[PDB]
Amino acid sequence: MREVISIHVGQAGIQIGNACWELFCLEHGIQPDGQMPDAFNTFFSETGAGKHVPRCVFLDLEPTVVDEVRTGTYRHLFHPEQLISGKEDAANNFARGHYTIGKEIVDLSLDRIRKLADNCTGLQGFLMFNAVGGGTGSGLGCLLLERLSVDYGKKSKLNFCSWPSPQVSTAVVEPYNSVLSTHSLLEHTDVAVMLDNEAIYDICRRNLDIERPTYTNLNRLIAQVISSLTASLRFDGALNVDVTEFQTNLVPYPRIHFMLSSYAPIISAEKAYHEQLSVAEITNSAFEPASMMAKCDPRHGKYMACCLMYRGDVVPKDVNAAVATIKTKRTIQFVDWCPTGFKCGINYQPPTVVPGGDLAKVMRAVCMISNSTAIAEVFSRMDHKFDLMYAKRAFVHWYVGEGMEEGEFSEAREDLAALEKDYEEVGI
Amino acid sequence: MREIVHVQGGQCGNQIGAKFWEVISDEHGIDPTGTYCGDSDLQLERINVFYNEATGGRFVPRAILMDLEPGTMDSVRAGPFGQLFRPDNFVFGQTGAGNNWAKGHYTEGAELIDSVLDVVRKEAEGCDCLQGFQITHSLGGGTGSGMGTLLISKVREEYPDRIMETFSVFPSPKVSDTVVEPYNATLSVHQLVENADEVQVIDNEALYDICFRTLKLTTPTYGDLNHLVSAAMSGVTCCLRFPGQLNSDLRKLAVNLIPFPRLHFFLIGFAPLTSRGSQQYRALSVPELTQQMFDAKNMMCASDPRHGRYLTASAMFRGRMSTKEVDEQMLNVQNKNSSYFVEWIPNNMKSSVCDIPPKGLKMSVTFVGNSTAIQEMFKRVSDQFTAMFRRKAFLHWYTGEGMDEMEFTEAESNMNDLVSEYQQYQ
C-alpha cells in the first residue's frame, strides 16, 4: 500500500525505536520470529515463507547497542543489513560525526534506504528518531537529513528528537551540539517534535505514580505516541489524518515547525479501570502544562495550531463537544490570526497494551501534537547557555581539532537568534 | 569492535595494575589459570576489550608490564593471577632508575622504549579498531614518572586519534616518598598536560583517610588500597564491557568533563563504602548513594572539594536500577548545592546507567569530577618546587644525566599558567 520508513540514529534513536518495533509487532499479531499465526503493510514488508520484515534501519557508530539487538530475541525479525554498525563512537562531538567518521557509514546507510524506498512507489515519508545531545544522533542525523533532502526532495520528513532538558542534562557539551544541529534541521526537515527526558519523568511520577522509573518506562510511552500518530495509516477510522496533512495543519511558516507533544491518559494498571476516561475529561487531562511532554510551560506562550488524534471508542459528537469547552476555557490562549486552530483525527482501533508493562487498557485515548510560541523560551534558554560557553571558547578545541572550521559556532548562533526573532514576531 | 590496551609502568603501576587484573578477571569469572567458569553469556559476550583468545580456550590480558627492576615484575608473576599475563609481555630493565626522572626519560629509559614500543605496536595494530590506552603509574618515583611519561609522549605522536586516560598517583600532602617529588612530579605534569586526554588523580593520604573512618579497617596494607582504587577503575569502563540503559565509554566522558584542553585533571570517588559491621544498617538506594558520593570524606584525592567549585562532573551508576530517581537526584544535588558548583555552566552532572552491578554488591556509583578545587595541589607542589629550584638543590643529578637548565624554568612556567587558568574561573 502506502508505507513509511523509520530511521534510527544514535543510542537514544536505537532504544526508543526498538520500543516502537516491540509495539508495532505486537499490535499486528506478528511473532518475534516475524511470521503471523493489508493493514500491517505501513510498517512491515513481505518475505518468502510468510514472514514480515520491518521498514527500519538501525544506525550507530559504536556497536555496543546495535550488536546487542542482533543477539536479542528479535534476531530474526530484522534484516541483517538493516542494522548497521561502525567500530568507534562519535563521543558527543557533532564535528566528529559530521566530518570524519560520518562519511564512511552514511553511504552504506543510504544504500539500504535506496533499496527499501524503491520496493514500492507512493510511500508517505520518513520518521527519524535521534538524540540531539548525543554525538552520532546529531552528527549522523544531519548527514542523512542533508543527503536525503537532495535526493528525495519531494517528500515529508518527520523528526522525533530527544531534546535536552533544562536542568537535567546527560552531558555538559550538549549546549554546543544543540545549537549546531538546530542550524542543520531548520532548512532540511519538515516537522520536528521536541521530546524531554525529565518531563516524562514528571509524567511517570504524578499521573502513573512510578516513584522509581527507568528507560524502559520512557520508551514505552514514546511508542504509544508514535503508534497514535500513525494509527490512521494502519487501521480504518471515522475521520483519518495522514502524515502528509500534518504539516498542512501545523506549519504556518517554513521556519516555524517546532512543536510539542502530549498523551492522555497516562494511567496505571489498578488506577485506571475504576474511573471513566470520559471523552470530555480525557482532553481536560491533555491541555494542562503538567501533562505536556516537553517541560515547556505554554501558559506564557500562544497556541498557533493543534492536532488531536483520538483512538478507540470515540464518537464525533463528543470530539466537537470537547473542543468547544476547551476553546471557551480561559487559561489557554489562542493566537488572534488562527481561528481554525483545531484538527481532529478519530481512529476506531483501541490502544494496544504491552502486558505486564507500564500502562493498562483504556477504552479511548488522545495524543496531542501542538505547535505553539512557547518554544521561544527553550531556544532562549539554550542560547543563554551557549553564550556563556562561547564567551571564552570552552570545548571549542575538541570541535575545531577534527576539521570543523571555527566560526560555524558564530553563524549557527545568529541563526538561532534569527529563529528566536521569528517566534517573537509571530506571537504578536 | 573496541579493545583497551593496558600499560603498567613503575613500582606503583605494577602493584595497582596486578590488583586491577584481579577484579576484572573476577568480574568476568576468569580462573587464575586462564580458563572460564560461570556459564553465562553476559560475562563473555564482550571480553575482547580486555582479553585475547589463544586456541586453548584461555584468555590473556592485553597488558604490557614495564619496569627497570626485575624484582617487582617477579612479585607480580609470583602472586596469584600471575600466570595469566603473557611471559612475552614482560619487558625487563637490567639497570634500574633511582628516582631520577632524567634517567627515566633521557638517558636510560630512552633505549628501553625501543624495546617496549615494539610490544605495544604489535598488540595495538593486530586489533580491528583500537579505542585507546590506559596507563597506571606513579609520579613520585623515577620509572613511573620518567619512562611512563615518555611512553605517553611517543604513542601520542604515533596514534593521535585514540584516547588516553591515566591512573596516576600524586605526591602526598603531609608526608612523602621520593624526596625529589617536585623534580619528578612537576617535570611530568607539564608533559602530561600536553599529551594526555584524561588524568585521574589518587592520593595516598586520601586512601588512608577513606580506609579509616568508612571501612573501619585497623591495618590497611596496599592490598586493600589497590583493591579500593581498582574498584574505581572497573567502574569507569563497565559500560564498555556490559550492556546498560545509558552506555558511556571513555570518549563519552572526555568530551563531557573537559571544557578547555589544558585542564583535564580529575577527582575520583567510589560508593558505597561501609564496614562489615554496619553493612545491613543502611538502606542501599539511590538517595543514599548520592549523599555518600558527594562528600569531602569520600574523594580518592585529598584536595578539599568545597574550597572550590565543581566545573563539570559525572556519576556513572551501576547495577540493576532505574533512571528517574538517579535523574532527579542529579537535579536535586545541583539545586541545593548551588554555591558548590559553577554558575555559567548549567546542568553540570552526568548520568550513565551500567546495568551490571560490581560483583558482590547490588547498586553502586563511581564519580569522576573535574573540579577547580584541585588547584590547591598544583600550588603546593609548585610551592615546594620554587624553594628547591631557587637554591639549585638536588640539581646536579638531573643536569649530570643530560637535562638542560632551561627545561626546569619552562616546566615551572607551564604549571604556573595552569594554576592561574584554574584560579581565574573561581
Binding site: 516491540e22 499465526p37 528507560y215 | 540503559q245 551490571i356
Partner: peptide, 22 residues
C-alpha cells in the same frame, strides 16, 4: 569463592515474547 552473575539487561527484561491481541 565467587557468586553467580545475576544482572539482567534492561532490554531483555522487557523485550520478551508477547501475547498477541485477538
Amino acid at each position: 569463592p565467587t557468586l553467580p552473575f545475576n544482572a539482567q539487561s534492561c532490554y531483555r527484561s522487557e523485550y520478551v515474547a508477547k501475547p498477541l491481541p485477538p
